[PDB]
Amino acid sequence: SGFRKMAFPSGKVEGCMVQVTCGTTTLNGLWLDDVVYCPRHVICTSEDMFNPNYEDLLIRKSNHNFLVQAGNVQLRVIGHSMQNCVLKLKVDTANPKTPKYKFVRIQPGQTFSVLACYNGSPSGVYQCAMRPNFTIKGSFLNGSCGSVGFNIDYDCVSFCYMHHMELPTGVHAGTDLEGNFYGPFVDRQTAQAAGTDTTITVNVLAWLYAAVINGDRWFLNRFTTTLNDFNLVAMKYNYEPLTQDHVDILGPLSAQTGIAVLDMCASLKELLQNGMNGRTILGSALLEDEFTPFDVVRQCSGVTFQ
Amino acid sequence: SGFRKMAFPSGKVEGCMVQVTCGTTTLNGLWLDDVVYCPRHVICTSEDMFNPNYEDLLIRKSNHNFLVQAGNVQLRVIGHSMQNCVLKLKVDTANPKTPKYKFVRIQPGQTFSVLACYNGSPSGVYQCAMRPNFTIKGSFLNGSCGSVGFNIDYDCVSFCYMHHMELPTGVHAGTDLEGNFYGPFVDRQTAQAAGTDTTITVNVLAWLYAAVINGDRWFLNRFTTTLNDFNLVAMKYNYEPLTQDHVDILGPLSAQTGIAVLDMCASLKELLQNGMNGRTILGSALLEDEFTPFDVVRQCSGVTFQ
């Protein structure tokens, strides 16, 4: 029993974290097969980040300038290239610690594990979610660029996030591992407004679904409410609307609790309209939108990777 | 920046995660050098768990009765022994994935990362704290005994936990790696009492300092309160008492922020008497006792002026 925000075992990823130093900048790279992925902004120093023409900045550049190193061993680039907002560079030797892996871009509301790294060495691991305004709530300090976001299925490690920078509203933005930013964001350092954020409803539903799994009944209430009055009180309290698709993703948990996915919405309305009235669901008076239903099953079943 | 319950990279431990099977029972072992550590009650059937004589059960069991496997390849047990409530298995070959490590006992209110395991295969990583009543609130289903607790300091993984059981209120109890349970518990199906639990004061005090690092002071207050009448309203709100030593380890967070531990103490007492009035400190309407001041420094860099 018990329920905790849970990260995947970082082990398959740690082996790919390397330090890249190009000029005055140092950040982290992803050493997969025989190529290192890292944020496009390694070629530019911290002073000229206002508006660099990155395409022009690379035209003069050559392989030899880049010092990519694994722990202590140094590596040389036999080919450099820029795809979107990464700088994928082919190195002399492959990484034999490369796991089975996939590149994926995830849609707002999913969750993943982050492996924070500073100067090529992982420092920490935690669990976040792509916010509906295309941000994340991370812990990233200086020298943390290129720290990755990932999921695991069996042997396979699908990477889904690579860190680029911090917004003036405290949050972070980056790209997918194809180098394409998440959200109305860009790398060039500018005032980008962290859009307004809505609560991910289906993920709050799932966390209530961990709750009755864990043996919490406080919020339970019998009377039910229409599908669309949910969408109605959803927009009222800045909650993302439910679709039938979510009702189907909740299907797997539906039978296991024995509650219809609709009835819990009504108990949710009780939480949202009446407030928590000073009590706790799964050790939180906060409604939690940072858990997807795959997240809840992985913890109540206890699936594994190896 | 930002603040997250963050675990250490579990990679160094995963290489030691191994499966142990005795009879009909399977749980996890800690494969360090050429010995596997695991909870002693794997020699036990569900029948003898009510009252076991472990010495007798272990003589009856032999080298060949123990099956330790790498999720894949089998390993050979050429020696078994019992240290308190663990079970050292001298295995034929050493583990070339052995980290630098320490066997360590931690004090209540300290924190560590747990790597949950099932059939020798990891499932997840998260952050905990040994509670003052000597429990932890984990995520543990069946087949998770022998999941270890660890920290990482530079290279070495100071080990501090091997999980044994679940208490009737949902929480968990286990041992150190010398085999000694934290708390008045032992491995025997009995009426085992989960003691009453108090909140870790020093961690909340520290956790307020992550909040002023965020630079939001809504909780900061003009009102001051004395040091020792606090220890009194502490027992009133079931908090373990603050000590001066606690304040000296907390001092480093004080000096870099410039807040005296006393006024943060006063803001806390005022905070608990009237409540937060529906506002949130670091995205939580619940106070956090699971962050050490070392945790707060490990996550906030800070600097100190003199």
Numbering used by the authors:
A (entry chain B), B (entry chain A): 1 to 306
Sentences from the paper on this structure:
SARS-CoV-2 Mpro is a cysteine protease that forms a dimer composed of two protomers. Each protomer comprises the chymotrypsin and 3C-like peptidase domains I and II (residues 10–99 and 100–182, respectively), with the active site consisting of a Cys145-His41 catalytic dyad located in the cleft between the two antiparallel-β-barrel domains. Mpro cleaves the polyproteins at 11 positions with a consensus cleavage sequence Leu Gln | (Ser, Ala, Gly) to release nsp’s, which are required to assemble the viral replication-transcription complex. In addition to the indispensable role in viral replication, SARS-CoV-2 Mpro also plays an essential role in escaping antiviral defense by cleaving host cell proteins.
